[PDB]
Amino acid sequence: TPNMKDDNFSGTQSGEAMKYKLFGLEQRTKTKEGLFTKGLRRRAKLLETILKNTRSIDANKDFNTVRYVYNRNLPKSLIEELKAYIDSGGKISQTTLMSLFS
Amino acid sequence: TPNMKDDNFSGTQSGEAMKYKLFGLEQRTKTKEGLFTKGLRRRAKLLETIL
Amino acid sequence: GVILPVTKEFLNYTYSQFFEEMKPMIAEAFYKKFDEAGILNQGNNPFGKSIAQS
Amino acid sequence: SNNVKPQVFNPDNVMMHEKKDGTLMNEFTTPILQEVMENSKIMQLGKYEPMEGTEKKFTFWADKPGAYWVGEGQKIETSKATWVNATMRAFKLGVILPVTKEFLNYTYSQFFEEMKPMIAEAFYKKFDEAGILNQGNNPFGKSIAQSIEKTNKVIKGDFTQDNIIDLEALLEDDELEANAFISKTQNRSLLRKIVDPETKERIYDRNSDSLDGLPVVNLKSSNLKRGELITGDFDKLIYGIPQLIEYKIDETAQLSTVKNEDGTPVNLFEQDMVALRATMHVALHIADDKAFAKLVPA
Amino acid sequence: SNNVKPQVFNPDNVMMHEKKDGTLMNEFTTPILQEVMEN
Amino acid sequence: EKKFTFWADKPGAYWVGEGQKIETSKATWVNATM
Amino acid sequence: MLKVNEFETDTDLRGNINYLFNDEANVVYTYDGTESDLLQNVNEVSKYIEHHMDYQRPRLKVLSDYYEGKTKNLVELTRRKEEYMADNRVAHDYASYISDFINGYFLGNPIQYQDDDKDVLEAIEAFNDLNDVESHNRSLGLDLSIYGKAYELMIRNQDDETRLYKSDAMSTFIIYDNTVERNSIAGVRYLRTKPIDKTDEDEVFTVDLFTSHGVYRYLTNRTNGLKLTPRENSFESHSFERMPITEFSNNERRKGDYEKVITLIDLYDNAESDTANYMSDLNDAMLLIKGNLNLDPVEVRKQKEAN
Amino acid sequence: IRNQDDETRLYKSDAMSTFIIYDNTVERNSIAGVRYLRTKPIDKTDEDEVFTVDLFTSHGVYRYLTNRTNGLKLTPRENSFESHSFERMPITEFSNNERRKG
Amino acid sequence: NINYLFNDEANVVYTYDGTESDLLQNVNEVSKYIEHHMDYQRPRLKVLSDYYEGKTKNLVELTRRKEEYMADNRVAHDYASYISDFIN
Amino acid sequence: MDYQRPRLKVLSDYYEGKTKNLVELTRRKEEYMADNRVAHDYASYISDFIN
Amino acid sequence: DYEKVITLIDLYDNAESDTANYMSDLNDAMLLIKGNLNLDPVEVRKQKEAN
Amino acid sequence: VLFLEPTVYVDAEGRETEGSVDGGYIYKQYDVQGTEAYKDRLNSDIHMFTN
């Protein structure tokens, strides 16, 4: 855990300082993530079974194909990400772009 | 909570430095946010029923 | 009417909220004195009137 | 020595697999219980009181202020309030059961689990007979029967509507109202056959176990005689439990109150034994000695 | 005052921290209402 | 034939002063048969 | 107080079991027989319940009290020298700081789902939205962080909906097949009922036993030795085909996140309350006067204003 | 609450005087909510600490009077019951975290 | 403080086994919950509120202070308010 | 059992943090004095990082 | 990965628990008074508040 | 408070004199400067000769 009493900051790219300081914590979290997915797969196996027994879904379906995608709760910078997405060919609808700025 | 007595500031961009120093507070707030939405959904359920 | 004296040592160390909790007990004492005077003509009632006298 | 026949104990408490005559108790049919665990009646009737330490303090208002009639401009006179204190302390119940590890392995491995119910029953009965009837080496200097004895608040005679009403009245004579009756189940025979000759309604509900509308609680104890009945404002009976039943099972300590054949104490390690200790802390307080009355046969 | 024996009052209506026997009501737990109020 | 074991003696209990020896007691069963 | 006697005299020295690092705690329950071999002999479930209460629960309880900041330093100092001195009870809450940080880092951002078949993906999304799975997942992550393991129960509700609820770790456990595959044979949940106005002496527990084909309900209490007596309308069928409870683990060893630093937190508590006592009990400074002299205690009052 | 002027109004209820009694099932539906206040004028005082108590059910509000000294014996107030048109208990509880610690 | 904030009876979740009708017919049980709230939960909340208002223990625990000729110099720091306002 | 298992057991105990200092009660005096036996968990920190 | 440093982990445990014992067992500070004198143990209780 | 009252010695001719009491903390110490400079030199030379 970051030792707040003996701490220093670099520049302004907070996420890039954080990914360095939390490197040790990331190693454990990746194993936890493996076991957590191992559990979610059972949750899905149960859900498909009850759905089929109630015939709320076709008996042909298979739930083990689902891919669980995990993102860390690191801090992010919408201004930099907009510049990175619109450079390199991104497109945004006017109403959406307006919705991003308060 | 930021320890004002032992504090130093970088450059001029307030927002990113704040999102660094409040990283720990954000973790708790995200859970509070979940429980709060859980409550607002009930408020909405009551409102739809009376409407 | 009544007067309740208290040693300020008592009011500081023994029971700080004494006067706030005693106020209703005094009110009860007054109600009892009044009831006993009006109904039973007891307790040196000042009125010349009472149910017991009626 | 190399002597292989089993150890005789004094007292004969220890559970053993091999009977000394050479019978081995194996393929043992686990006993069955023909009875239901008795709840403690003090728990059933008394007011509970959370108690952190082994001791508790109570303080109550005792004197209220006076009042005076004062004429115009007369000196208002003084008055005073007063309080009083009371206190209650806990005592400890316990028993130990020794069990030979042969017995615990081959005869009846369940043994300690089956003893817990019967121990807690034994405790509850001990407590009830102490606090209610002042029997069984009552540690507390307090009890219902002892308050009754100091107040002489006893009625003499047979179970009758007359005496039962008088018994309940004996409490409001002190501005207290009865809450329940304590009786011996042997005597519901008597309660079942008493009826008002005027309204021709029976005072005891055979169906609901209610006497004069109040609930009746039955003691199993043998000290309370058939013809005896107890009543009181049980809200005045306060009990506390600093420590519920704790069980500890031990494999290395010594039992000193059990002696080997030669008179040596039993060592659980060297003699290959295991034993269970059950203990409980219980505290009893009679808030007002006058709140209880008793009816006794003449 | 510096009196080490508590002050005797006549009538004895004054509330006191120290009893006549020298007991001191420090950390004294607040009394409780053993009876209801009489309207 | 049928065979029953029933609990017959409940263990006892003792008022124990603090630090005093907790004494022991024993339960026993009885056998009956049909 | 010859030590061999301290058992019989109940002198033996109180709470000194280790709990956290004991061998019986944190074990995985296994059973050699099939589900039927277990269910026909319900007593065996009573043994597992007893073992859990006596060895696993205490560990979890300790962990939970640390998460609630009720560290050993608060409770133990109840036995402090309660003389005319100050209290100086202190608890630093490190356990909460840690668990909140690690859990927020892992699950503060919702898990996303992808699939190639939109029918399955939308059925999943419907179930997630109905059960508010985002908040559920975060709460599971928090139990993983403090206790090291967490449990979730899935039930078909009376309103005919598939519902997902977290089950507290102090009250839930699973009995697994003894094979290397370790399928879960049966799960149990048991809760102490109590009235609010009393301590129920018997400490009555309501026990639910989950099999792959239904839920069995029983009633017990501690002092009767946990003899399972079926509750009225004991059995209730469920339409899954496997035991509904699922268990999640923080790591291979199912050890909590701060479990291994509790001793350091304790040491920090003791050190800080020691400095607090030093501050409270000694006078900061004094004017020392020596030698044979007459000091009038009336004159000493001028000490603050004399030059 | 649906106001007298026929409007849906939302008001905060103080924590020191409000609580909810939940269904014992794992779902923990809220069975009933209660609010209670020590009513006082600003002159006299009473040893009967009289509390006004409002009990909210899924079908209405029940009003009672009590005091601590009689042992909190609930006596229905005049016009005790008042129906409300919701179909579930109106009070909602929010939590700072699972433990509800400040 | 400690004895009110960390009491096991404070902060508990109230549960009832019977239905709403089972309660409403037996309103007395509501009386028991009210009593329990007053005796255990309320004190905790009251202490938390007093700290938000800055009436910390040091200001009200005059029981062991001295004032025969020195000043009282009791103090309260209001950390509780600074924290709660910032986080909220 | 006689030679290899002991080694593996010890390595496992260090990963669990049951370092020698906790179990070696053999010296600490059973008086009014405090124990302060401590274990640091370096083994787990290292293994989790490297893995 | 830590087998070769288990001895250093042991040494760090010993050193830390040693300092924990020193902290536990010695008094931080005391007012030392020497010489032939009469101290009333009732008066010594004023030590915290005397000037 | 630590109070040390000296023994008073009485002479056969009636004289009186006091023993010398004393009290204070003592603590162990070692040559940190020289031992750390030595061990640092060893470590440095190992790495220098092994590049």
Q: Which residue of J has its CA nearest to A29?
A: J48
Q: Is D123 helix (H, G, I), strand (E, B) or coil?
A: helix
**Type of residue found at L26:** I
The span from the CA of G162 to the CA of H32, in Å, is: 26
Q: Which of H27, H98, H101 sits opposite G142 (nearest CB)?
A: H98
CA C38 from centre of chain: 15
Q: Is the N-terminal amide bond of C5 cis, ω within 30° of 0? A: no
CA distances from D196 to D156, D216, G160 (A): 20, 19, 58
CA distances from G275 to A30, G83, J7, K29 (A): 41, 18, 43, 10
Interface test with B, best of G67, G99, G100 (most B CBs within 10 A): G100
The span from the CA of J4 to the CA of J12, in Å, is: 13
Asked if I23 and I17 touch (Cβ cutoff 8 Å), the reply is no
Q: Which of A14, A17, A73 sits opposite B27 (nearest CB)?
A: A73
Q: Is D67 in contact with C29 (Cβ distance < 8 A)?
A: yes
The technique is: cryo-EM
Resolution for this PDB entry, in angstroms: 3.4
Beta strands D273-286 and D237-250, pairing class: antiparallel
The span from the CA of A44 to the CA of A60, in Å, is: 15
Q: Is L3 on the interface with K (CB under 8 A)?
A: yes
Interface test with I, best of G85, G196, G269, G303 (most I CBs within 10 A): G196
Asked if G191 and G217 touch (Cβ cutoff 8 Å), the reply is no
Give the minimum alpha-carbon distance from F24 to chain D in angstroms, rounded to a whole number.
4
Burial of G165 per CB tally in 10 Å (0-12, 13-18, 19+): middle
Tokens 């509780």, located at residue:
I80
Tell me, yes or no, whether chains D and G touch by having 3 or more C-beta pairs under 8 A: yes
Asked if D289 and D169 touch (Cβ cutoff 8 Å), the reply is no
Q: Is F22 in contact with G8 (Cβ distance < 8 A)?
A: yes
Structure tokens at B39: 């409550």
Tokens 């004969």, located at residue:
D12
Q: Give the count of Cβ contacts less than 8 A between chain G and K.
A: 29
Q: Is A28 in contact with J48 (Cβ distance < 8 A)?
A: yes
Alpha helices in D19-160 (DSSP H): 41-45, 101-102, 111-131, 144-151
Asked if G288 and K34 touch (Cβ cutoff 8 Å), the reply is no
Give all chains having 3 or more CB-to-CB distances under 8 Å with chain D. Answer: C, E, F, G
Taking the CB of residue G216, how many other CB atoms lie within 10 A of it?
20
The span from the CA of G119 to the CA of D92, in Å, is: 67
In 3D, which of L16, L17, L21 has the Cα closest to residue L5? L21
In 3D, which of G50, F13, F23, G227 has the Cα closest to residue D98? F23
- For residue G78, give the DSSP letter: G
Asked if H76 and H54 touch (Cβ cutoff 8 Å), the reply is no
Q: Is G305 helix (H, G, I), strand (E, B) or coil?
A: coil
Give all chains having 3 or more CB-to-CB distances under 8 Å with chain I. Answer: B, C, G, H
Asked if H66 and I31 touch (Cβ cutoff 8 Å), the reply is yes
Which residues of E fall within a CB distance of 8 Å from D78? 11, 13
Q: Which of D66, D69, D76 sits opposite C46 (nearest CB)?
A: D69
Tell me, yes or no, whether chains F and A touch by having 3 or more C-beta pairs under 8 A: no
The span from the CA of B27 to the CA of A73, in Å, is: 8
Q: Which of D60, D80, D83 sits opposite E13 (nearest CB)?
A: D80
Q: Is L31 helix (H, G, I), strand (E, B) or coil?
A: coil
**Type of residue found at D204:** Y
Structure tokens at D193: 């056959």
Which residues of G fall within a CB distance of 8 Å from I69? 301
Give all chains having 3 or more CB-to-CB distances under 8 Å with chain A. Answer: B, G, J
Q: Is K23 in contact with G271 (Cβ distance < 8 A)?
A: yes
The span from the CA of G184 to the CA of G173, in Å, is: 10
Interface test with G, best of K28, K46, K47 (most G CBs within 10 A): K28
D183, β-bridge pairs: D218, D229
